[PDB]
RNA sequence: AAUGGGUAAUUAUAGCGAGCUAGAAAGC
């Protein structure tokens, strides 16, 4: 099985700076087990395995089916819950369950229920001890904002 | 009945605890 390595780069970055900074993207998926595709950074460096199955179709497609069947979270709501996945210690724990429950009664109570199994989701896979679920809530909540950008 | 006096209880209670939008764009 092979291991990729994905940079994403903006308009017009030269094509030598571009195929080295993905070239140290691959030598990062190459260190690891097998192999992993290591996206956009030297980290989120996930194994083929526990991504496409488990990111790409499995979480990234949670969060779209909540935040399409919806309206009133928004992209601050994605916003603070990347930021609640990228600092994580044991009080941001606390925090985000102080967040989410206090959200949950911020609903319109038709849709609190839908709110309320994905914040079990959130707070599951936030809170897993696997340490896989929440890198891949990261790297998923980073590709639904990357979908939804104006 | 006189005369001397006041004595005790509560000292805030129940909530909301931020929400949304933007999350970098042009150039060299």
Known sequence: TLSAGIGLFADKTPISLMAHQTGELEEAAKGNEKDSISLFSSDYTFKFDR???????????????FFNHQDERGKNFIYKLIELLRNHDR????????????LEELTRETDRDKFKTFKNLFYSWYTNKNDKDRKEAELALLLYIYEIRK
């Open 91 to 102: 009080m941001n724990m606390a925090r985000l369950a102080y967040y989410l429950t206090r």
């Open 51 to 65: 991504f496409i199955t488990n990111v790409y179709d499995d979480k990234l497609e949670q969060i779209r089916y």
